[PDB]
Each structure stands twice: as structure tokens, then as C-alpha cells.
Symmetry: C3
Subunit: 91 residues, 3 copies
Amino acid sequence: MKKIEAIIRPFKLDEVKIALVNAGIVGMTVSEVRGFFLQKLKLEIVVEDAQVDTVIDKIVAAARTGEIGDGKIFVSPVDQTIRIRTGEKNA
Amino acid sequence: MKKIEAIIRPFKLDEVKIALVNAGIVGMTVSEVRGFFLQKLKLEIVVEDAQVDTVIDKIVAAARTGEIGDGKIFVSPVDQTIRIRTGEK
Amino acid sequence: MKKIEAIIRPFKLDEVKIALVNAGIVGMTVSEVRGFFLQKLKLEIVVEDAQVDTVIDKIVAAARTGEIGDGKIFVSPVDQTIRIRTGEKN
């Protein structure tokens, strides 16, 4: 499992969201961030390793404009995920 | 050392906070997040490996309601922690 | 590559920012966080492994005051970085 964090232009949110739903990406967290100080959105998703590349492509395709400031995607390892409602774990 | 991030229902904050203090969990960071777009809180703590399971349980017990949307906990590795005040590593 | 997250006193931002520019640190993300509930800023940067220690020192030197609440720095692994504009990966 990997965490994928994407720093995108705020107005791209909808587009990106749509794409991620189309790839059956379920859980997803978004927070307001300042980068460059420009306002950006940070999207966080956690997916299986096999999905990573796929997801990246879609985000890229949805978040891209062609100009500097399109932002960036970071992939990092996740050891464990726990669903609070049930306490179910996957590793 | 592991980073523990929990995305919870905002109103659960107090409860969760209490529990974490009861387990001697000291440093803790909280930010507003939108998930699902519902308002959530993201809590971040960094603890020793041996504490991980314990902490998870408490968070679960404190943050749970029984309904969809209770949120999620992610555990990820941390290589290094540095205290800014002293530079201790 | 490593992600460096620093939780600092808000007013230190400028100082810290200057220092990071002086070490050629380019991309950098800042968000408002509540820690301890005191208002803090979380700075996130991703750098090559070889840079890590350097960066840490500068942040420390820039963010420090000597009192409790100076905050903390966490270093964690990053597997992959992708530039959205081009799709370039490292």
C-alpha cells in the first residue's frame, strides 16, 4: 500500500475527483495548503501498489494545464490501514 | 518509529484527545480536512513501534460511532525525529 | 528521497523560508495546524537523501527559540516524485 499526495491547482479539484471516481478510487482527503505563496489543494489517497501508476496517470491527466505551477505528486509507503468503524486492518 | 494519521469526525476530537493523553501520548497535530465532501479532522502522532497497536485501539475506541464515515487510520514509517528547541535526534 | 515535515511557530515562517532558499531548497508546502491547542505551521519539503541533514540543521537554526514549543521535525521515505506539468518521474 502507498500513500499518494498530489498538490494541485484548486479549480482542478472537480476534474481530478471525477477521474478518481472513474477508476474506482474510494477514500480521499483534501486540505488547503499554500505552496509555490499560492493557494493549492493537497489531495491524499491510499491505494494498493498495483494501482499506483494508474492513479498517477489519471491525476496527471486531470490536473495538468501545461504551465508552471501545475504542482506535484509524491508516493510514500504505508505499512498499515485500519478502518475505525470496525477495527479491520490491512497491511 | 511510526506516524499514525487518523481521519475522524470533528466532534470526536475531545474524546480522542482524552484517550491519547491517558496513554501518555504527548505530541499531536490536528488539521481540518475534507474527505468522503464532508468536513473531517486529520490527527497526526508519531510514536515508538511498540506503542502503535495500543494507540490504534484507543483511537478506534474513542473515534468510533458504528456508522459509515467513522474514518480511517494510516500507519507509515518515520526514519528520524528532531526536536527543534535542542536539535536532539 | 525523503519527506521532511517541520512543525514550527508561525512567526518563524519567514526566517525558515529564507534559510531554505539559501540552501537552494525549491519546492515547499505550508499548512496551518494545531499542536501542543496552539496554532502551528507544518512545512513539508521533499529532498534527496544527501541533503537531509543539511536541511534539518538549517531549519533547526532558523526555527529555534530555546523554549518548549519550538516544535519538531519528522523525516520519512518517499518512493517516487512526479511533476504534474510534464509527467516526469524520479
